[PDB]
Write a protein that binds this ligand. Structure first.
Ligand code: HEM
Ligand SMILES: CCCCCCCCO[C@@H]1O[C@H](CO)[C@@H](O)[C@H](O)[C@H]1O
Ligand SMILES: Nc1cc(N2CCCCC2)nc(N)[n+]1[O-]
Length: 469
């Protein structure tokens, strides 16, 4: 490939066809940071036979993310995930249509219904497990801890419970069942990045197929039909699939895709948040102080009146949420930059924006971006800090864990509420400690850049107990 007039800087690397496939795959953030240093805020790279133009000027993001599908296609990842990763085939499939239908089931009123059920399920699973284990300290990995309880509760909230009214045995059954779902799901979640790259070994392939087969059985419509207090989201989705004449077996596959889609981020998000608090005594004291003040007067103020916790969650996501925002270039076109520049992109190129690098870890926007500063999103007077700058201009987009434009989180309020509820339960109802107070924060699994929340390369040992009194 030879650069044409008005195109971004072009960097093909050394290896024919593959280009920077290895570098990008191994550690996308480090690789792209170097490319930014070399080329500036926009550049084109060869990666695995594809030409990818990377845009890293956060002021220029807004234009891109709202472009019509006639210019920049925002359906490609959804199709790839549905058909190529989760093995789902739907008739007349349109990601926009599916998204619009889901929105209608996730309006403010319904998200508030989910929030109420979520607290009940978080409480039931957390205190249920803790009660079964008994009053002592119990040792666990913090990710296993956070991901298990959030996913199990999220599953019970969206997909329903064993019985209503709730009984001792039905709740116990949901603890065992949800644990099975989680343990099976985690095997898929660990293998997903390798599946996406097509790098599974013969043995890995058999493992993934076995896990998929089990999950498809567990979340079959026949199994789900008997469950109580199913979410409107689920009921509507099932009705939609039925109306399209989708088989119950294919519905199962679609439902497993949704399990990963909706539950693959909250647990990891909470893991990092709790870890940051445990490693930063002042931050932890501020959060506990805020929550205890509310307790002394789920108390509704925990959701609507936790300014310190809001900053903490924003700060944790700033450091750890790393989704790619991608588009396929549909036609040869000119893309405007915020500074007045214009760059030509070619039909068939991929466009990649990476908020993790900028704005989120941009040292011109945030002072010491690598550091967890619990009050980064607080003004001195305690009000929310919303004013961040780059290149002499106020940023519209400064922290983007929920996406932007056409592809943004439809469950944000519920996701935020769920994480807050979990943190409240853990910090107020439990004692929670690092085994080693001096343990260093683990590196990311660097191969997972682009999906959403990062996961740690290894877990962090903690211990918890029910608060003695
Ligand atoms: C911390 C947790 C979460 C984060 C950071 C997050 C972030 C995101 C992002 C970045 C997208 C855009 C995806 C893309 O098109 O590339 C998205 C989409 C979406 N999210 Fe979330 N999300 C979270 C949790 C949830 C939860 C708990 C729900 C509901 C239970 C939810 C519902 C949705 C829906 C329905 C979409 C649109 C899917 C589609 O395009 O068909 N999210 N989210
Ligand atoms: C790299 C995995 C993180 C998710 C990125 C979502 C946007 C593109 O998703 C996929 O990425 C693959 C590898 O780059 C490409 O080969 C596929 O064509 C593309 O659909
Ligand atoms: N982060 C994501 C991603 C996601 N996807 C659905 C399929 C298309 C892009 C990824 N769905 C949901 N619910 N969340 O929360």
């Amino acid at each position: 490939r030879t650069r044409r007039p008005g195109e971004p800087p072009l960097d093909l690397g050394s290896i024919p066809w593959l280009g920077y496939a290895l570098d990008f795959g191994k550690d996308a953030a480090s690789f792209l940071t170097r490319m930014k240093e070399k080329h500036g805020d926009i550049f084109t790279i060869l990666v695995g036979g594809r030409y990818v133009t990377v845009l890293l000027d956060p002021h220029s993001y807004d234009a891109v993310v709202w472009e019509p599908r006639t210019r920049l296609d925002f359906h490609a990842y959804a199709i790839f995930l549905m058909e190529r990763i989760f093995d789902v085939q739907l008739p007349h499939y349109s990601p926009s249509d599916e998204k619009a239908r889901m929105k209608l089931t996730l309006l403010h009123r319904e998200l508030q219904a989910l929030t109420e059920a979520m607290y009940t399920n978080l409480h039931a699973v957390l205190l249920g497990d803790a009660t079964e284990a008994g009053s002592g300290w119990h040792e666990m990995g913090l990710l296993d801890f956070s991901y298990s309880f959030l996913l199990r509760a999220g599953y019970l909230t969206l997909y329903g419970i064993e019985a209503l009214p709730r009984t001792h045995e039905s709740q116990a059954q949901d603890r065992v069942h949800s644990a099975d779902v989680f343990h099976t799901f985690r095997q898929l979640d660990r293998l997903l990045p390798k599946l996406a790259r097509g790098s599974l070994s013969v043995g890995d392939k058999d493992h993934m197929c076995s896990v998929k087969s089990r999950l498809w059985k567990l979340l079959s419509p026949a199994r789900l039909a008997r469950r109580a207090h199913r979410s409107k989201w689920l009921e509507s989705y099932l009705l939609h699939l039925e109306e399209m004449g989708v088989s119950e077996e294919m519905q199962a596959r679609a439902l497993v895709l949704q399990l990963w889609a909706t539950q693959g981020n909250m647990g990891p998000a909470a893991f990092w948040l709790l870890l940051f608090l445990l490693k930063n005594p002042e931050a932890l004291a501020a959060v506990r102080g805020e929550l205890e003040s509310i307790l002394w007067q789920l108390p509704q103020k925990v959701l609507d009146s936790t300014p310190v916790l809001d900053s903490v969650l924003s700060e944790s996501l700033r450091l750890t949420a790393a989704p790619f925002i991608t588009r396929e270039v549909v036609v040869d076109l000119a893309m405007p930059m915020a500074d007045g520049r214009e760059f030509n992109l070619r039909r068939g190129d991929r466009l990649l924006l990476f908020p993790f690098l900028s704005p989120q870890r941009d040292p011109e926007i945030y002072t010491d971006p690598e550091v967890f500063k619990y009050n980064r999103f607080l003004n001195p007077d305690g009000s929310e800090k919303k004013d961040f700058y780059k290149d002499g201009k106020r940023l519209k987009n400064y922290n983007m864990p929920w996406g932007a434009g056409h592809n943004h989180c439809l469950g944000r309020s519920y996701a935020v509420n769920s994480i807050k509820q979990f943190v409240f339960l853990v910090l107020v109802h439990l004692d929670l400690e690092l085994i080693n107070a001096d343990v260093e924060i683990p590196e990311f699994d660097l191969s997972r850049y682009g999906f959403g929340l990062m996961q740690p390369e290894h877990d962090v040992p903690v211990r918890y107990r029910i608060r003695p009194h």
